[PDB]
């Protein structure tokens, strides 16, 4: 019964895959397109109403066997169109009566070195589940954006709207998923009913193509992502249904490692949303990218984390209304993905901003003492690799900060901070300018990182020592 249980968990999808095979067996006429609709219906209900999906599993697979029958009976060329439906119904039969019930039971949440390997593999599995439970709205949202940024239309536009107004306001995430699934399927169905013989000669999305699979492959993978996400949610639910702190940082190296895998975007988050805005204005360099520049230099200027936390409400609204408007002006567009990667990062820092409200010794010396000195070498090599006028400015700031450096590393925070905040302005200006007047931004971005890291060392409690 080992293999029966394997089939009572990892083989229902064979029936689903076969559904597609039938639907895409050569020239798809109406009946093959309805076959697709049936496959879609199954997977869609899985998301919408899990309980009801489970209620009509094998019954519906047998109703499908009923479809395949009629086809083969009525309709070598003709025999190949009988063969495939037959193959489909055969697979169903096996699950239908023999593995369907123990599957409804697997979904019911309501030598020497082999044992060692099994334990190792077990650890991995559990951990990976946890990660993919929380980091999956990301990949869903990113893929539905990459698809609708390539195929600009007015029927894939709604998908951008969904995953770009549900990332800032994260209470909509469930309904985003729901409406995306139905709509992606509407797209799939319409585009297929356009590969017909009576449908012959684009803004609205629907067009004609000749690998019918290749054409409707993109939007099919989206349906896939969406559904796979729900599987992971419920699988992890089942696992626990049935069956890295601050202190750890100051103990061993592994203790610190854990603290950061747990929280990295918790702490270093304002810094990463600023290093994502520098990427937009470095890969796009147009004119609509200059407003991202002005936001950076009006958020950075309020130097207090608390004040910045009152402007984040508007930074996040702007970045979402700008992606939509720039894609309305691209329909009447594959670099607008940098305006997404940043609506993601910034929607996530809006979350930290409302949730904070609720041999290792060797490394700490070489980060909190001999790093100011490495930042100063980078300032030199930021301005002597790119020969320009702006580059001379960097050379001359290195010279000042090397001479009056010892005094700076000693002064009270007020002043240390003022001086480091001035050097940060030069960089943001060489970045906003190199754009307005157009050798690039890469070396000024390595620098913007280092200087934002040292602002954190100079404001710590470990620097007091």
- 175: its two tokens: 């309904």
Quote the CA–CA distance of 414 and 392 in Å, as a whole number: 28
Which are the residues after which the chain is interrupted (C to N > 2.5 Å)?
75, 110, 201, 243, 332, 358, 438
Say whether 301 sits in a helix, a strand or coil.
Answer: coil
Quote the CA–CA distance of 382 and 441 in Å, as a whole number: 10
Are 297 and 450 in contact, with CB atoms under 8 Å apart? no
Give the DSSP letter of residue 96. I
Are 352 and 265 in contact, with CB atoms under 8 Å apart? yes
379: left (phi over 0), alpha (psi -120 to 50) or beta: alpha
Quote the CA–CA distance of 447 and 431 in Å, as a whole number: 11
Instruction: Please name which of 192, 66, 147 lies closest in space to residue 337, comparing C-alpha atoms.
Output: 147
Angle at 171 (CA atoms; ends 168, 177), nearest 5 degrees? 90
Quote the CA–CA distance of 68 and 82 in Å, as a whole number: 9
Residue with tokens 């193509």: 209
Give the DSSP letter of residue 461. S
- Residue 141, CA distances (Å) to 106, 111, 155, 160 in order: 30, 44, 17, 9
Buried b (16+ CB within 10 A) or exposed e, 377-404: ebbeebbeebeeebbebbeebbeebeee
3-state secondary structure 176-235: HHHHHHHHHHHHHHHHHCCCCCCCCCCCCCCCCCCCHHHHCCHHHHHHHHHHHHHHHHHH
Instruction: Please name which of 229, 219, 233 lies closest in space to residue 159, comparing C-alpha atoms.
Output: 219
Residue 67: count of CB within 10 angstroms of its CB: 18
Residue with tokens 């190199």: 434
Angle at 410 (CA atoms; ends 404, 414), nearest 5 degrees? 95
Query: How many Cα atoms sit within 13 Å of 238 on the Cβ side?
Result: 11
Quote the CA–CA distance of 329 and 344 in Å, as a whole number: 21
Task: Please count the residues of the chain.
Answer: 465
Quote the CA–CA distance of 224 and 218 in Å, as a whole number: 10
3-state secondary structure 372-399: HHHHHHHHHHHHCCCCCHHHHHHHHHHH
User: Is 361 buried (19+), middle (13-18) or exposed (0-12) by CB count in 10 A?
Assistant: exposed
Q: What is the DSSP string of 36-85?
A: HHHHHHHHHHHHH-HHHHHHTSHHHHHHHHHHHHHHHHH--HHHHHHHHH
Resolution to 1 decimal place, in Å: 3.3
């Amino acid at each position: 019964e080992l293999v029966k249980g394997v089939y009572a968990k990892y083989w229902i999808y064979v029936c689903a895959g076969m559904f597609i095979v039938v639907s895409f067996a050569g020239r798809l006429v109406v009946y093959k397109i309805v076959y697709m609709f049936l496959f879609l219906l199954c997977l869609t209900l899985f998301q919408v109403y899990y309980s009801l999906w489970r209620k009509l599993l094998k019954a519906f697979w047998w109703l499908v066997v009923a479809y395949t029958m009629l086809v083969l009976i009525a309709v070598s060329e003709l025999f190949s169109s009988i063969l495939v439906p037959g193959f489909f119904l055969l697979a169903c039969i096996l699950q239908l009566h023999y593995f369907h019930r123990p599957f409804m039971q697997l979904t019911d949440m309501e030598l020497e070195l082999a044992a060692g390997f099994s334990d190792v593999l077990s650890r991995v599995q559990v951990f990976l589940r946890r990660l993919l439970e929380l980091h999956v709205f990301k990949l869903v949202a990113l893929y539905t954006v990459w698809v609708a940024l390539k195929e600009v239309s007015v029927m894939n536009l709604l998908l951008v709207v969904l995953w770009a107004f549900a990332l800032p306001y994260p209470r909509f995430r469930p309904m985003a998923s729901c409406l995306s699934t139905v709509w992606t399927c509407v797209i799939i169905v319409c585009k297929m009913l356009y590969q017909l013989k009576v449908v012959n000669p684009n803004w609205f999305g629907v067009r004609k193509g000749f690998p019918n699979l290749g054409y409707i492959q993109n939007h099919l993978q989206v349906l896939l992502l969406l559904v796979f996400e729900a599987i992971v949610y419920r699988r992890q639910e089942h696992y626990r249904r049935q069956h890295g702190t601050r202190q750890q940082l100051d103990q061993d190296l592994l203790g610190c490692l854990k603290y950061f895998i747990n929280f990295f975007f918790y702490k270093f988050g304002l810094e990463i949303c600023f290093l994502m805005a520098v990427n937009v204005i470095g890969q796009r360099m147009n004119f609509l990218v200059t407003l991202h520049g002005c936001w950076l230099v009006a958020i950075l200027t309020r130097r207090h984390r608390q004040a910045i936390a009152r402007l984040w409400p508007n930074y996040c609204l702007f970045l979402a209304l700008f992606l939509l408007y720039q894609y309305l002006l691209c329909l009447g567009s594959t670099n607008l993905i940098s305006d997404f990667l940043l609506l993601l990062c910034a929607s996530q820092q809006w979350q930290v901003f409302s949730a904070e409200r609720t041999y290792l010794d060797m490394l700490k010396v070489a980060v909190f003492r001999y790093l100011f000195w490495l930042v100063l070498v980078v300032v030199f090599v930021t301005g002597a690799t790119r020969i320009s006028i702006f580059g001379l400015g960097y050379l001359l700031a290195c010279f000042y900060l090397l001479l009056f450096g010892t005094a700076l590393l000693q002064r009270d925070t007020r002043a240390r901070l003022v001086l480091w905040d001035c050097l940060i302005l030069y960089n943001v200006t060489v970045i906003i300018s190199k754009n307005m007047l157009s050798a690039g931004i890469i070396w000024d971005s390595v620098c913007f990182f280092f200087l934002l890291l040292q602002r954190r060392v100079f404001l710590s409690h470990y620097y007091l020592h």
